[PDB]
Amino acid sequence: MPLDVALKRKYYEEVRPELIRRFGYQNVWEVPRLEKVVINQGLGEAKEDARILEKAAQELALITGQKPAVTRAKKSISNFKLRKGMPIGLRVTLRRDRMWIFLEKLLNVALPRIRDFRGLNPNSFDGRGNYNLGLREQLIFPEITYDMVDALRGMDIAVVTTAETDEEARALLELLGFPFRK
Amino acid sequence: RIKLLLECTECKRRNYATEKNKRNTPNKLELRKYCPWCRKHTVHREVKI
Amino acid sequence: MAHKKGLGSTRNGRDSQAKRLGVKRYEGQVVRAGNILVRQRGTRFKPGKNVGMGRDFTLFALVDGVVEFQDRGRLGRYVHVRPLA
Amino acid sequence: RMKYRKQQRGRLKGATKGGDYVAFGDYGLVALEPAWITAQQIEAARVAMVRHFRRGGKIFIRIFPDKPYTKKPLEVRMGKGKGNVEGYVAVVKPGRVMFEVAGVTEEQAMEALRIAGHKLPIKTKIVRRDAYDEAQ
RNA sequence: CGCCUCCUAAAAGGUAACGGAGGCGCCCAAAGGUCCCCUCAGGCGGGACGGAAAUCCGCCGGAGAGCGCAAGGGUAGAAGGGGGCCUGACUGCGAGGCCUGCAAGCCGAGCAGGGGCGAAAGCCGGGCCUAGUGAACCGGUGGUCCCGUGUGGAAGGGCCA
RNA sequence: GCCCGGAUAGCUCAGUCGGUAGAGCAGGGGAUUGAAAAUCCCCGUGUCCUUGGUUCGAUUCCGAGUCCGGGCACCA
RNA sequence: GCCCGGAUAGCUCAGUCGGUAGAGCAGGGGAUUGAAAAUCCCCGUGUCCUUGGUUCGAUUCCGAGUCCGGGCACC
Ligand SMILES: *[PH](O)(O)OC[C@H]1O[C@@H](n2cnc3c(N)ncnc32)[C@H](O)[C@@H]1N
Numbered sequence: 074m075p076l077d078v079a080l081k082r083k084y085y086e087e088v089r090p091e092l093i094r095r096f097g098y099q100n101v102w103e104v105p106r107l108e109k110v111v112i113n114q115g116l117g118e119a120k121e122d123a124r125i126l127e128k129a130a131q132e133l134a135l136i137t138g139q140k141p142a143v144t145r146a147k148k149s150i151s152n153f154k155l156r157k158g159m160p161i162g163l164r165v166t167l168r169r170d171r172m173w174i175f176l177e178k179l180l181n182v183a184l185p186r187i188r189d190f191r192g193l194n195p196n197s198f199d200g201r202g203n204y205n206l207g208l209r210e211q212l213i214f215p216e217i218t219y220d221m222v223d224a225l226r227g228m229d230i231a232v233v234t235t236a237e238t239d240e241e242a243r244a245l246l247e248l249l250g251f252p253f254r255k
Numbered sequence: 256r257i258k259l260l261l262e263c264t265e266c267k268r269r270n271y272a273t274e275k276n277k278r279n280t281p282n283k284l285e286l287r288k289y290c291p292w293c294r295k296h297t298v299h300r301e302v303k304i
Numbered sequence: 305m306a307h308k309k310g311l312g313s314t315r316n317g318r319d320s321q322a323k324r325l326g327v328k329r330y331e332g333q334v335v336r337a338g339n340i341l342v343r344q345r346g347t348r349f350k351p352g353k354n355v356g357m358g359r360d361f362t363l364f365a366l367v368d369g370v371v372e373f374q375d376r377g378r379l380g381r382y383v384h385v386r387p388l389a
Numbered sequence: 390r391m392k393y394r395k396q397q398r399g400r401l402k403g404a405t406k407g408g409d410y411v412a413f414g415d416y417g418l419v420a421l422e423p424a425w426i427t428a429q430q431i432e433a434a435r436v437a438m439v440r441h442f443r444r445g446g447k448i449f450i451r452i453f454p455d456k457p458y459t460k461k462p463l464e465v466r467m468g469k470g471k472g473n474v475e476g477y478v479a480v481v482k483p484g485r486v487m488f489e490v491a492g493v494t495e496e497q498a499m500e501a502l503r504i505a506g507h508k509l510p511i512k513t514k515i516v517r518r519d520a521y522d523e524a525q
Numbered sequence: 526c527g528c529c530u531c532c533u534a535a536a537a538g539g540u541a542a543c544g545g546a547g548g549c550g551c552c553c554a555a556a557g558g559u560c561c562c563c564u565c566a567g568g569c570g571g572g573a574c575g576g577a578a579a580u581c582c583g584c585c586g587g588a589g590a591g592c593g594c595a596a597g598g599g600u601a602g603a604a605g606g607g608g609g610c611c612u613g614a615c616u617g618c619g620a621g622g623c624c625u626g627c628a629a630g631c632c633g634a635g636c637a638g639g640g641g642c643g644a645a646a647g648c649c650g651g652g653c654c655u656a657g658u659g660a661a662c663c664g665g666u667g668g669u670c671c672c673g674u675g676u677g678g679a680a681g682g683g684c685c686a
Numbered sequence: 687g688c689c690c691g692g693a694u695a696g697c698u699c700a701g702u703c704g705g706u707a708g709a710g711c712a713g714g715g716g717a718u719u720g721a722a723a724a725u726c727c728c729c730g731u732g733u734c735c736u737u738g739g740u741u742c743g744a745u746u747c748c749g750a751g752u753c754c755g756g757g758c759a760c761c762a
Numbered sequence: 763g764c765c766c767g768g769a770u771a772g773c774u775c776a777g778u779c780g781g782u783a784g785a786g787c788a789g790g791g792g793a794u795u796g797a798a799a800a801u802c803c804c805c806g807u808g809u810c811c812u813u814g815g816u817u818c819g820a821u822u823c824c825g826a827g828u829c830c831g832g833g834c835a836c837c
Contacts, residue, residue: 113581115574122818147818154578155814164581200571201583207573227574231582259552263667263686271667273686274614281554288612296615296639303667311763311835312462314470316545320530323655324624324631325598326538337634338621345655346599358632361599361654364622366634379602398545401533468543 074174081177085249092244105202105236105245109168110175112137113207115227117145117161128221129163135216137175139165172232179230180250183212192253202242204231206253266291266299329363332371335385339365342383350376354385390428392454392477399474400456409485412518414449416491416498418505421484422512428454428478434505441501442491451487452479484514 090101097104114133120126123143134140141163148157184192187210198205207229236242243252258279265271270291287301329341337356342349342363351357352374354367369385376382404424418434420426431454438448458476461469481487493501502515 111581113573116580118579119574144818148815149819150579152809152813156579157815159579162580166581196571198571198583203571203583205571205582207581209573209575211573223574225574227580229573229581231572233582257551265667271686272616276614277552277554279552279554284554287554290613290615290639292616306837308837309466311837312465312469313543313763314472315543316470317526318531318544318546319528321528321656322539322624324538325655328538328623336621338619338632340622340632343623343632344598346597347604348599350602354634356632356634358634359654360632362623362632364633471544 077177077182078174081173081175081181084177084181085173088249092248096244103235103237105234105241107176107232107234107236107245107249109166109233110172110230111164111166111233112230113164114229115225117147117163118150119227120145120161122146125221125224128224131217131220132211132225133163133165137165137167137171139167176232176246176250178215179212180246183215184251187213192251193255194253195255196239197246197253198234198236198242199239202236202239202245203234207231262302262304264289264299264301265303266293266297266301269293269297270299271303272299329371331373335365335371336368337365337385341365341371348381350380350382352376352382352384355383390432390454390477392428392456395457398457398472399459404480404482406483407481407485409451409481409483409487411486411488411522413486413488414490415517416448416489416493416502417517418451418487418489418502418513418515419484420481420487420506420511420513422482423485423510424480424482425456425458426452426479426481426510427476429476430509431479434502434509437505437508438489438491438501441497441504442493446490446492448489448491451489452481452485454478455480 085106089106093101093104114129117126117129119129122145126141126143126145128141129145130140130142132140145161145163147160149155184190190210194206196205209228210226211224211228232246234242234245236245246252258277260278261275262277262285263271263273263275264287266289270293272289272291285302287299289299289301290296291299293299325343325345327342329335329339335341337354340362341355344361344363346361349355349357349361349363351363351366352372354365354369355372356364356366358364363383365385367385368388370388372384372386374382374384409419431452435448442448454477456478457474458478459471459473460475461467461471461473487506489498489502489505491498491501493499499515506513506515
């Protein structure tokens with residue numbers, strides 16, 4: 074555990090200067106590093122309120138620190154254009170290091186893990202070189218067992234990077250955490 | 256008569272001040288505050304139906 | 305058996321009481337507090353020095369000042385009262 | 390006519406001058422001493438032209454079915470809310486740039502207009518492109 | 526057939542019309558105080574349960590989303606979105622002005638007692654404002670503790686709320 | 687604004703002058719069943735509206751609260 | 763110039779006040795008949811008009827709208 078902690082620490086610390094000058098030649102800047110990572114998941118309407126809301130709890134929890142209560146369908150998805158406020162903001166905006174043992178554990182230690190979990194995804198982030206890819210099925214047992222039949226699945230996170238333009242960002246998490254195929 | 260009924264404040268037997276008010280949401284719950292001409296300001300209380 | 309006109313009173317019962325407000329206090333004129341100046345049901349007016357904006361967007365004289373017309377050009381309209389004399 | 394999906398019921402009345410002039414193809418019909426002109430009458434001309442022109446190669450446009458004219462009642466006595474919508478049309482008054490093409494190549498177009506408007510409803514004149522025009 | 530808003534009042538203001546249009550005769554116990562923070566819709570690009578439209582990431586933007594309620598004014602230099610603590614939505618009152626012939630209705634610095642938000646420079650005598658309104662009589666109730674038809678009291682009654 | 691009644695099983699309603707909660711119907715279960723019934727047995731649920739005091743205890747007794755039902759009287 | 767979707771199952775209409783949807787008729791499948799009716803058993807059915815808003819939850823409560831209705835159109 075703190076094992077893979079020291080791990081990401083190194084992966085990146087070195088890889089960084091590595092490609093850093095390999096191609097950069099700017100001034101070893103965020104050319105192209107990664108900072109803070111928010112994570113978001115399958116909106117409250119995915120609710121049952123008490124039940125799967127508390128499950129969202131368990132999960133958000135053991136995953137990175139924060140676990141769901143009972144309120145996930147207000148101003149309701151209702152019928153099509155039928156919705157009011159937005160009291161279903163269930164996400165983790167944790168900011169740094171924790172995040173890195175995470176890049177670790179998460180990408181590099183749980184990446185392929187369950188049903189054909191391959192990863193042959195085109196322009197992963199591409200929306201400015203900052204993230205993109207959230208997976209559509211939990212890291213199954215990134216911990217816990219049957220603590221809810223359907224429990225959870227709509228999973229998707231995002232990193233705040235500086236890997237500016239893509240090709241660059243690409244160098245970045247490509248060698249840093251694995252670039253899923255063509 | 257509607258969820259709008261009129262009450263008014265009176266204070267610990269040493270005065271009474273007035274003002275209307277309502278019925279709706281927290282209904283009865285009626286302490287409040289206000290200050291009578293009793294002494295110089297003073298709690299008052301409110302309630303009084 | 306009786307062709308005389310025909311009913312026809314569709315109806316537009318519309319009405320708006322008369323009103324007031326506005327640019328109502330002349331340049332320089334002797335302007336004392338309590339004396340109201342320019343009422344605005346908006347914000348064409350920023351209560352500059354000694355200009356008191358009443359609980360209604362009503363420009364009222366806060367001090368014994370000579371009618372101070374301070375259009376602060378673009379910032380907007382700024383009203384001011386000048387230190388008597 | 391066309392003054393579709395309006396927004397209000399009625400206008401009012403006045404007249405005096407405006408802003409029609411240019412060219413837009415070189416087959417032009419310009420008003421001169423009018424006012425409003427029936428969207429219909431209008432279509433009239435439209436027809437006149439369209440038909441004359443060996444019945445095909447398109448003309449263009451000009452004014453619009455603009456306002457809603459009301460004679461209100463039907464013939465009653467007067468005091469209705471002045472309601473009633475009824476005849477819709479153009480509001481062009483100082484010799485206006487009325488623009489109609491086709492590819493007549495000639496006094497043929499001429500005729501087309503000739504009747505169209507001779508018809509329509511006023512003292513008016515016609516021509517082509519006479520002093521271009523420069524915009525930004 | 527009372528009131529608010531817009532047009533026509535034609536540029537001060539301000540005016541009919543069986544002239545156009547269109548709302549209100551609620552409340553909001555906390556949209557009432559103040560202190561501290563925040564800051565739109567929508568366009569685009571990238572994304573779990575999506576999947577025209579949530580939720581999150583990445584840019585873009587006289588602010589056209591927003592402010593119970595209609596319009597209009599305003600206005601995110603927020604009146605707007607969030608948190609803390611609290612009653613002044615105080616009595617005594619006001620000088621001096623808006624409009625108005627009548628009565629109306631309406632604007633308000635500042636002095637007093639008295640508190641509440643900051644440590645304080647100060648804001649708070651309801652709300653973001655322009656409609657939610659009604660004389661006079663008559664009578665009720667909570668005072669008060671002024672009057673009483675010889676005097677003591679009292680039916681009853683004067684002013685306050 | 688007074689003056690009476692109630693608040694109980696899902697429904698409609700009994701109920702010691704303080705010791706148990708009960709009908710009738712609905713609902714469900716078997717026998718019967720050309721057959722529909724009627725018959726025929728069997729069950730199901732209760733802060734007895736709420737809050738306190740009386741009593742060893744209280745559906746009950748008393749005060750108070752909310753609600754519904756009744757009635758009777760005015761209204762500038 | 764009116765009165766209420768005056769709505770909800772295929773139809774005619776109950777029921778809610780926001781938790782509950784129902785009934786009759788129709789209909790689908792067996793049974794009786796030689797075969798159809800009738801009759802006898804079995805069964806399934808609902809964006810409670812669209813619409814935003816409130817609420818933890820709306821067929822039901824507000825706000826807007828569509829439709830079908832009802833009072834005059836004539837002194
Ligand atoms: P009737 O059957 O004759 O039809 C209408 C006639 O009555 C007279 N009339 C109608 N309405 C009137 C008003 N408001 N004022 C005066 N006379 C009115 C008409 O003359 C008509 N002929």
